[PDB]
Design a protein around this ligand. Structure first.
Ligand SMILES: Cc1cc2nc3c(=O)[nH]c(=O)nc-3n(C[C@H](O)[C@H](O)[C@H](O)COP(=O)(O)O)c2cc1C
Ligand code: SF4
Ligand code: SF4
Ligand code: SF4
Ligand code: FES
Ligand code: FES
Ligand SMILES: [K+]
Lengths: 263, 213, 43, 430
């Protein structure tokens, strides 16, 4: 009808106009690497981890933002794509702190996992690293902002989803910092969700701090009873004890969010 | 300098700032330059107007602008910290800004930089105890052919030598206002030693007009 | 015909509010602005 | 024609380049500005766009896209939104300072260009974005706009043609990245000067979300003359696909650094010798030239001996015309430090939005700082080359490219000099 034909590694796909290159790859069952893109937030296109090669085109495109055109062949595993990912991963890790053993994201970190699958296996950065001061934004969300990779997910979530315009970027260049600028607390009934959408250990659950690692927890898919919405949750347990509460995706109820009482 | 604000007695949300009546009329004209429904476009000119009235931008000045335009205060904080012409700390009365990018560096911007430091007895980034001068380096000021040069407040002083800059500070320190422009012998961007072009009188109206217009 | 003097000396007299005063001056010449239809994107 | 570079005064456009005549409306009118402008507006946009197309004019802001085709993207039926012309007077590329002279000495050329250009695009107003540092230049331009309003040249019934047009001036606040066309648009909208991804392209979604064309000051200011005198006249200067006259800034190690207008495709040597008084200490003292602002890669004395100043000639020499800001360096120049300071410039201007520039440009800066002292190993030169390639073509805007190209120029032509510093350092600290 109004669908158009594109190719992902030569496999034909029929997509609605406006579908992005990243969304076309989902249909054939490929997940393009990402950091800044989140399907429930506005497109940002700043991390550049989603860069992919379109056949015959000399420039890689940001799959998360680029609308796919008719007849395009998206080469998701070509050397030009692979070298783009290795280059971006190299820049993301250049200033990242060597924190994994003390970092609570360790074991369920997108930076770790996409470094394993898409990055290089070693470093050639021979300088010193950036270090930034931490921001206090309440008793729920701990900030270790040296780990931040400036994806701006928290800013976009706070503004669009929570309707709170208290998070932004201050400064410029390598010294651009995410935060409130002034001493402010980010206290919203949905605030705890920035822990989930932050890809790194920059934002973490203060109550959960240091207590468990993700591989050792048992997951129980259950229902919230703090209100009458019936939000779908996952109860993380370990050796008989409840460790934390996570959202469970349900498009018709809570999507992938929960309230701060539930959390 | 830092990009996080910590309240202090000189700089806190209750530091008194407000636009004068004259500046509110100017604010109205600034806001009228943009489509209705997009008043956020007035953030840059109105922060600058606040700084022109006050000299710098206390956090209370930032909050006033956010209140006038009905933009979240954070969105004004982002602008204030992004653009380098906004002073988030008090500066000296005469903000001396020495270009040190390669074209000016190639024409001995260092000699200018040391000329000012010995004269005022300060290092880059500092303010004199009498709070009259503040020295900082800056990137290309768009006057490269007249290098080396400095900008003091809104004025450019160009084709400088160590003597010329020491003289300018004496005039400023003496209550006088030196004349902006090249200090060598030429007027603007012309070759020194005689123009190599534009010596014939310019043509009058209608010269060269294509047929049938 | 004169070609040996600088004819751009008016900016030796410009002050702090020169640009904003001219903008205020031009306010009466502008055409009415277009409207997005709402007070702001947050309305 | 096979040789270029002897432009006569009668063929020059910016005839008050040096500010030796009255810059106000009476003086500009006496020099031919604002002449038969009503006739041009009534000729129609298709005629104007046709004239610019045949002139061969290309963008004078850096990238140099064909101007006639770029402006034609706006020649589409109004879809309810206002259409805008944004004039880029940010003038930020180091070594570049030509747009400063148009603004303060020939403002009425810029104003008439906005009107003529705006009519071609079907635009209701022009926003002139000018860097905040140029305060006096903005005041001059603001005075000229007032005269054009008081004379009915713009405003309601602009030039008596029945077309309404406004000319707003908006000042920057200190940011080289606001010269990028989409970062400029974001800046007018009251946000941080962070570029937008493409698509959408400004002709579809621009300032305030409306169809917009961003044009450099020099591109706009020549258009009334191209229309008055015809695109055939303009196209008769310079090599084919490199047409017209261009403003050149010659700075650095020359006897008489100056701004001058000259024909495209002029030899770089002739331009330096004829107008700037030659290289300081003689032509044999020349080390390198950055032909077109800091973003373009440098070329060594051997290449400059015969290169022509235009887009295709300089592309062939592995560089670019850029803004035609010619930065000359002589054999007394610490060439590594000169380029290191440019990387330091880009480090301070990156908006920080996207990873390869935010992190990568600061990384090259740290490496360059070590190359100046030789506190490095020769294996790091190829590492730095690969780092620059990882930045180029992977960023949102071309600032990432403009930081990588200077580095590639240094490694391309001065690799042995980089390795000499590493040798000297290694001997001393043993
Ligand atoms: C970092 C950066 C800075 C730029 N600065 C300017 C500038 O100061 N003036 C300008 O005209 N174009 C500048 N540009 C180019 C603009 O993005 C755009 O290409 C230009 O305004 C188009 O105008 P034109 O086609 O008439 O040349 C810059 C681009 C980048 C990436
Ligand atoms: S965020 Fe991920 S990569 Fe960074 S320290 Fe934590 S676990 Fe390691
Ligand atoms: S704190 Fe986390 S979510 Fe926010 S910008 Fe940094 S990495 Fe992204
Ligand atoms: S390349 Fe640099 S200046 Fe351009 S968008 Fe990315 S971070 Fe900003
Ligand atoms: S996921 Fe596309 S640039 Fe971040
Ligand atoms: S390098 Fe100093 S004004 Fe351009
Ligand atoms: K997290």
């Amino acid at each position: 009808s109004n669908l158009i034909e594109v190719f992902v590694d030569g496999q034909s796909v029929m997509v609605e106009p406006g579908t992005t290159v990243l969304q076309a790859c989902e249909k054939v069952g490929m997940q393009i690497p990402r950091f800044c893109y989140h399907e429930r937030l506005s497109v940002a296109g700043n991390c550049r981890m989603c860069l992919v090669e379109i056949e015959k085109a000399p420039k890689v495109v940001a799959a998360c933002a680029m609308p796919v055109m008719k007849g395009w062949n998206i080469l998701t595993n070509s050397e030009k794509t692979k070298k783009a990912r290795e280059g971006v991963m190299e820049f993301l890790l250049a200033n990242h702190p060597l924190d994994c053993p003390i970092c609570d994201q360790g074991g369920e970190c997108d930076l770790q996992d996409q470094s394993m699958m898409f990055g290089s296996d070693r470093s050639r950065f021979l300088e010193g690293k950036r270090a930034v001061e931490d921001k206090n934004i309440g008793p729920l969300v701990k900030t270790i902002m040296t780990r931040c990779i400036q994806c701006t997910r928290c800013i976009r979530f706070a503004s669009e989803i929570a309707g709170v315009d208290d998070l932004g970027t201050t400064g410029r260049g390598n010294d651009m910092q995410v935060g409130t600028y002034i001493e402010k607390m980010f206290m919203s009934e949905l605030s705890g969700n920035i822990i989930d959408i932050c890809p790194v250990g920059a934002l973490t659950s203060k109550p959960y701090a240091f207590t468990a690692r993700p591989w050792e927890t048992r997951k129980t898919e259950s229902i919230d009873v703090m209100d009458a919405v019936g939000s779908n949750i996952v109860v993380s347990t370990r050796t008989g004890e409840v460790m934390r509460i996570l959202p469970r995706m349900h498009e018709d109820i809570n999507e992938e969010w929960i309230s701060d009482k539930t959390r | 300098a830092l990009f996080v604000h910590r309240d202090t007695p000189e700089n806190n949300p209750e530091t008194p700032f407000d636009f004068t009546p004259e500046n509110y009329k100017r604010i109205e004209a600034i806001v009228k330059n943009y489509p209705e429904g997009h008043k956020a476009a007035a953030v840059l000119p109105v922060l600058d107007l606040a700084q022109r009235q006050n000299g710098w931008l206390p956090i209370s000045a930032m909050n006033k602008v956010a209140e006038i335009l009905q933009v979240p205060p954070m969105r004004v904080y982002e602008v204030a910290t992004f653009y380098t012409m906004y002073n988030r700390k008090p500066v000296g009365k005469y903000h001396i800004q020495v270009c040190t990018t390669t074209p000016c560096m190639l024409r001995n911007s260092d000699s200018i930089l040391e000329a000012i430091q010995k004269k005022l007895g300060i290092k880059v980034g500092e303010t004199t105890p009498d709070k009259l001068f503040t020295l900082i380096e800056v990137e290309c000021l768009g006057a490269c052919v007249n290098a080396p040069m400095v900008q003091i407040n809104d004025n450019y002083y160009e084709d400088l030598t160590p003597k010329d800059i020491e003289e300018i500070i004496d005039e400023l320190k003496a209550g006088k206002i030196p004349k902006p422009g090249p200090r060598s012998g030429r007027f603007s961007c012309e070759p020194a030693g005689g123009l190599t072009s534009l010596t014939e009188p310019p043509k009058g109206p209608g010269f060269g007009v294509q047929a049938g217009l | 015909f004169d070609n040996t003097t600088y004819k751009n000396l008016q900016h030796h007299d410009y002050s702090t509010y020169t640009f904003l005063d001219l903008n205020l001056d031009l306010s009466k010449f502008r055409m009415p602005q277009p409207s997005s239809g709402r007070e702001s994107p947050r309305h | 024609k096979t040789s270029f570079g002897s432009l006569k005064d009668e063929d020059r456009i910016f005839t008050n380049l040096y500010g030796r005549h009255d810059w106000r409306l009476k003086g500009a009118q006496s020099r031919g500005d604002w002449y038969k402008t009503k006739e041009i507006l009534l000729k129609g946009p298709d005629w104007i766009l046709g004239e610019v197309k045949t002139s061969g004019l290309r963008g004078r802001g850096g990238a140099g896209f064909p101007t006639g085709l770029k402006w034609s993207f706006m020649n589409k039926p109004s879809d309810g939104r206002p259409k805008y012309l944004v004039v880029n007077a940010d003038e930020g590329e180091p070594g570049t300072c030509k747009d400063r002279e148009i603004i303060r000495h020939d403002p009425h050329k810029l104003v008439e260009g906005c009107l003529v250009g705006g009519r071609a695009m079907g635009a209701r107003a022009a926003y002139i974005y000018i860097r905040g540092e140029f305060y006096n230049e903005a005041s001059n331009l603001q005075v000229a706009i007032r005269e054009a309003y008081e004379a009915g040249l713009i405003g309601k019934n602009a030039c008596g043609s029945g077309y309404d047009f406004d000319v707003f001036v908006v000042r920057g606040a200190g940011a080289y990245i606001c010269g990028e066309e989409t970062a400029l648009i974001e800046s007018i909208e009251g946000k941080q000067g962070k570029p937008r991804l493409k698509p959408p392209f400004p002709a579809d979604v621009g300032v305030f979300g409306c169809p917009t064309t961003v044009a450099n000051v020099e591109t706009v200011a020549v258009s009334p003359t191209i229309c008055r005198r015809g695109g055939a006249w303009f196209a008769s200067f310079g090599r084919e696909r490199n047409s017209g006259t261009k403003l050149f800034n010659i700075s650095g190690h020359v006897n008489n650094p100056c701004t001058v207008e000259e024909e495209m495709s002029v030899p770089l040597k002739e331009l330096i010798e004829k107008h700037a008084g030659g290289v300081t200490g003689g032509w044999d003292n020349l080390l390198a030239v950055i032909p077109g602002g800091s973003s373009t890669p440098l070329i060594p004395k051997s290449v400059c001996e015969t290169v022509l100043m235009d887009f295709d000639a300089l592309i062939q020499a592995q560089t670019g015309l850029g803004t035609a800001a010619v930065i000359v360096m002589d054999r007394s120049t610490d060439i590594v430090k000169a380029i290191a300071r440019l990387i330091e410039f880009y480090k301070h201007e990156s908006c920080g939005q996207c990873t390869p520039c935010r992190e990568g440009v600061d990384w090259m800066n740290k490496v360059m700082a070590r190359f100046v002292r030789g506190d490095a190993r020769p294996a790091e030169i190829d590492s730095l080359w690969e780092i620059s390639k990882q930045i180029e073509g992977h960023t949102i805007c071309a600032l990432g490219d403009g930081a990588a190209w200077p580095v590639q120029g240094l490694i391309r032509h001065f690799r042995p000099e980089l390795e000499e510093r590493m040798q000297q350092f290694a001997q001393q600290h043993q």
